[PDB]
Amino acid sequence: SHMINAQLLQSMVDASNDGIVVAEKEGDDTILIYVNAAFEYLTGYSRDEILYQDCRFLQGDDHDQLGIARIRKAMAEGRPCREVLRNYRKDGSAFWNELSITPVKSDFDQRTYFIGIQKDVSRQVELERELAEL
Amino acid sequence: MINAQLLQSMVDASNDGIVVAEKEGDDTILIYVNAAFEYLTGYSRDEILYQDCRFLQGDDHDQLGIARIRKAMAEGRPCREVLRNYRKDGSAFWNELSITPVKSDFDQRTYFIGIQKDVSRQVELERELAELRA
Ligand SMILES: Cc1cc2nc3c(=O)[nH]c(=O)nc-3n(C[C@H](O)[C@H](O)[C@H](O)COP(=O)(O)O)c2cc1C
Ligand SMILES: Cc1cc2nc3c(=O)[nH]c(=O)nc-3n(C[C@H](O)[C@H](O)[C@H](O)COP(=O)(O)O)c2cc1C
């Protein structure tokens, strides 16, 4: 009587300020099958551009970031993980992405999907460094 | 095809508190809260459901943002305000609150999505850094 319906679930995901994505594993890729508006705003990429691609384009030229090894191992072991990564928007600007990945098993196909949540921590990091200097 | 199970998992994974409230008269009472909201406020889902979120203001009221929230809600505008809020144990924190009115043709009920996050540290840093800058 008083409880939410499924359209409300979509509304909560749409209202989120952090990016929220769903990806599915294929071989060495985990390809984006859903992104919310905040992900497009945060990354500068449109939904049409980046769907069915692995999120690693957000690392740009940066690789062998330690968090990436931790993510790969957590993915292999079926465990959730959280890493702060250097990421880059479509225009090339850098941001610090606090990224969480949660595997969830879909009852429909009994397939494991991966929920990402991207939070821009750049301002908090830079301000922490500035105050450390001060 | 993102089903309701996956949408729910996306809400459950959110770092930020996420709630749904429905308006009855001058109350908007909580009909859903996620785990991040419970951890942020220290209240369990069973304690706070079907109550207006204003209990989080505690002894405080007449904060300027509250007046802005009221006007924005009456006008159906989304809004964002940083409010002083209080946990179950009484501890104070700065809550960046984003309220989004839900537009739905399906049911007559008017709903609001709240998104809450603890900005206390960023506020502390901002004031300290501004003072030291002088
Ligand atoms: C659901 C999901 C979301 C992801 N989001 C990001 C992201 O926003 N930024 C990023 O740098 N990596 C993200 N990744 C990690 C990469 O997609 C990839 O798994 C990681 O770089 C390790 O794979 P690789 O060594 O083959 O590049 C995400 C991974 C998953 C599964
Ligand atoms: C969906 C939603 C979530 C809200 N969350 C909070 C909150 O977390 N903390 C808070 O102090 N007020 C929150 N509010 C605002 C109060 O519920 C209330 O609308 C505000 O105090 C102004 O109403 P009032 O002047 O009648 O007290 C929320 C409102 C809505 C609609």
Numbering used by the authors:
A (entry chain A): -1 to 132
B (entry chain C): 1 to 134
Show the paper's wording:
Members of the LOV protein family are blue-light photoreceptors employing LOV domains as photosensory modules, controlling a number of cellular responses like phototropism, chloroplast movement, stomatal opening, regulation of circadian rhythms, photo-induced growth patterns and pigment synthesis. LOV domains are structurally well-conserved that typically bind a flavin chromophore (FMN, flavin mononucleotide; FAD, flavin adenine dinucleotide or RF, riboflavin). Upon light absorption, they undergo a metastable covalent bond formation between the C4a atom of the flavin ring and the sulfur of the neighboring cysteine residue. Structure of LOV proteins are conserved that consist of a core domain with ~110 amino acids that forms a PAS fold composing a central five-stranded antiparallel β-sheet surrounded by helices.
We recently reported both, dark and fully-adapted light state crystal structures of a short LOV protein PpSB1 possessing core domain flanked by N- and C-terminal helices. A direct comparison of the two structures revealed large structural differences such as ~29° rotation between the two protein chains in the dimer, an altered dimer interface and ~11 Å movement of the C-terminus in Jα helices. Substitution of the Arg66 to an isoleucine in PpSB1-LOV was reported to accelerate the dark recovery by a factor of 100 to τREC = 23 ± 1 min in comparison to the wild-type protein (τREC = 2471 ± 22 min). The faster dark recovery of the mutant protein is presumably due to the loss of the salt bridge between Arg66 and the phosphate moiety of the FMN chromophore that was previously observed in the wild-type crystal structure (inset). Additionally, the dark state crystal structure of the double mutant PpSB1-LOV-R61H/R66I (where an additional arginine 61 was replaced by histidine residue) is essentially same as the wild-type PpSB1-LOV. The overall structure of the mutant and the wild type is similar with the a root-mean-square-distance (rmsd) of ~0.68 Å for equivalent Cα atom pairs for all residues in the two dimers. Each protein chain of the dimer is bound to an FMN cofactor shown as stick models (colored by element: carbon, yellow; nitrogen, blue; oxygen, red; phosphorus, pink). The N- and C-terminal residues are structurally disordered and were not included in the final model in the PpSB1-LOV crystal structures (N-terminal 20 amino acids, C-terminal 8–9 amino acids). Larger structural flexibility and conformational heterogeneity of the end regions is observed for PpSB1-LOV-R66I dark-state solution structure as compared to light-state solution structure. Consistency of the global changes observed in solution in the current study using SAXS with those observed in the respective crystal structures further supports the signaling mechanism in PpSB1-LOV proteins, where rotation of two protein chains relative to each other causes large movements in the C-terminal Jα helices, relaying the light-activated signal to the associated effector domains.
